[PDB]
Design a protein around this ligand. Structure first.
Ligand SMILES: c1ccc2[nH]ncc2c1
Ligand SMILES: [Cl-]
Ligand SMILES: [Cl-]
Ligand SMILES: [Cl-]
Length: 163
């Protein structure tokens, strides 16, 4: 575990992370995809061997010795708000299990279902609160990666609020 487990946020490409493992915002079919998923495919293509897994689950594949945790959030274009919320919570619980199993002291994580799976809605708060519910009982240093300058401020504020 980390000596004083923390949450941090960085605005940069998760493919350049400084953590002991990475969470991919995966599709269920283990396809290269776009956004976070395509950057992850370009950096760790070996991790996409038999990475396909259902919605609400996480599947780890090693790229050398570096773990890639493929976490499949719901596409809110297809799910109801209620069912989507349940699957988004579940995907993060499966990430917490994998992070624990791997024995890593740090993890880079994107906000699941906030991009092309968002169904055109702002899900920063919904996705971040499910991230916290899952990861609060783990002792890994968590570093959340985002792209948008206003999202960085709001994630930083949410972390600071609970400290
Ligand atoms: C992908 C490419 C460039 C980027 N700059 N900040 C976040 C990010 C993600
Ligand atoms: Cl970058
Ligand atoms: Cl997404
Ligand atoms: Cl973002």
């Amino acid at each position: 575990g980390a000596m004083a487990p923390s949450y941090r946020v960085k605005r940069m490409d998760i493919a350049k992370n400084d953590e002991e493992c990475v969470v991919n915002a995966a599709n269920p079919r283990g396809l290269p995809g776009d956004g976070v998923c395509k950057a992850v495919y370009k950096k760790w293509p070996e991790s996409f061997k038999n990475s396909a897994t259902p919605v609400g689950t996480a599947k780890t594949v090693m790229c050398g010795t570096y773990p890639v945790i493929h976490a499949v959030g719901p596409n809110f274009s297809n799910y109801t708000e209620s069912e989507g919320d349940r699957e988004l919570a579940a995907a993060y619980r499966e990430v917490a299990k994998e992070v624990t199993r791997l024995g890593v002291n740090s993890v880079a994580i994107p906000l699941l279902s906030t991009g092309v799976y968002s169904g055109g809605k702002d899900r920063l708060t919904q996705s971040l609160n499910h991230l916290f519910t899952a990861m609060d009982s783990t002792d890994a240093d968590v570093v959340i990666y985002c792209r948008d300058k206003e999202w960085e401020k709001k994630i930083s504020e949410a972390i600071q609020m609970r400290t």
